[PDB]
Structure formats: structure tokens, C-alpha cells
């Protein structure tokens, strides 16, 4: 049987998100892409460096906002800019969010040598697409 990126059915008590409920054969039919850049286009270059930056960002943000991320990130590149769009929870205090936004935006700008901006969208609870 196939296993990649599939959430196995259960009794019915397990909540899943939209992206987590669709398998790889829906990535261009019912889902989009979590990262958007030009590396993988025909005739373009530096697709390998853009991938290592993505892998590091998803981990930097998972450990920098522990227990706060409601769903996967959405990385966007428009020229020199790098826009990180995240959906976070409302448990943490806003004072601590503004601290981490300025700490991460700055640390990542000096690391990758690019202007970085972070966009948060708070939700009360993790959105549920269905129950498996």
C-alpha cells in the first residue's frame, strides 16, 4: 500500500486540516504549493539553495513559535524579498508575538542577506476540515 503524506483513517475521533487530509496526487488539483519561487522553472537556476533555505525556515519557525503554529507555513519570494505567512494560535500573549516577529525578521535578514517580513494570522483553534 501507499503511505506517503497520507493520514490513515481511524475510528472518527482524529481531526485533520485541509492540507493534511489530501494526498500527493492532489497537489495541483485540490492543493497548491507551500513555497513559491522560480528555481524549478525551465531555464532557471539555484533551485538547490532555495530548498535548503525553505527546510531551515520551517524548522526555525517551529521551534521559535513552540506550540503556536496552527498549520504549515507559506513561503513567498518576490525578487529579493522573502515573505513568511503563518497561521498561529491565540494562547500566547501579543507582547510575546511582537518580540518574536522582530527577533526572527531581523535574525533571518542577516543570515540570508535579504529583507524578510513575517505575516501572522491568528485563529482561535486549529481549523478542522474533517474527522478521520
Amino acid at each position: 500500500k501507499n503511505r506517503a503524506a497520507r493520514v490513515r483513517v481511524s475510528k472518527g475521533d482524529k481531526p485533520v486540516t485541509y492540507e493534511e487530509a489530501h494526498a500527493p496526487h492532489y497537489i495541483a488539483h485540490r492543493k497548491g504549493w507551500l513555497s513559491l519561487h522560480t528555481g524549478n522553472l525551465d531555464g532557471e537556476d539555484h533551485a538547490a539553495e532555495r530548498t535548503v533555505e525553505d527546510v531551515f525556515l520551517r524548522k526555525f519557525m517551529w521551534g521559535t513559535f513552540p506550540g503556536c503554529l496552527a498549520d504549515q507555513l507559506v513561503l513567498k519570494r518576490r525578487g529579493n524579498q522573502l515573505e513568511i505567512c503563518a497561521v498561529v494560535l491565540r494562547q500566547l500573549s501579543p507582547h510575546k508575538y511582537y518580540f518574536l516577529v522582530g527577533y526572527s525578521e531581523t535574525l533571518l535578514s542577516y543570515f540570508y542577506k535579504c529583507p524578510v517580513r513575517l505575516h501572522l494570522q491568528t485563529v482561535p483553534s486549529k481549523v478542522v476540515y474533517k474527522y478521520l
Binding site: 531551515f56 526555525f60 521551534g63 521559535t64 513552540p66 527577533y103 543570515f111
Partner: protein, 49 residues
């Protein structure tokens, strides 16, 4: 450069700004093996000689 990525995030964890769920895992296992007696020996002064 894996040195930079690993040394940076090791420092950020000691500073309290990055939470490594993986080190916490293997740090808890390495703490339970000391209570069980399975502790790493001293270099040079090992079981063999």
C-alpha cells in the same frame, strides 16, 4: 555549511530562543540511563585495559 546551522541553533537553544524537540528527547533518554546505570564511562579508564 552544517557547522553554522548546527552551531547557531545550539547557541539559540542555550539562550532560550529556539526549542529543539529532538535534543529534549535524547536529553531525557540520556538522563534515564544514568538512573539505570547505563552511563558513558570515563575515557581511558574503561572496562578494558
Amino acid at each position: 555549511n552544517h557547522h553554522t546551522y548546527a552551531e547557531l541553533m545550539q547557541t539559540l537553544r542555550f539562550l532560550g530562543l529556539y526549542r529543539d524537540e529532538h535534543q529534549d528527547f535524547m536529553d531525557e533518554q540520556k538522563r534515564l540511563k544514568k538512573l539505570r546505570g547505563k552511563e558513558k564511562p570515563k575515557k581511558g579508564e574503561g572496562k578494558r585495559a
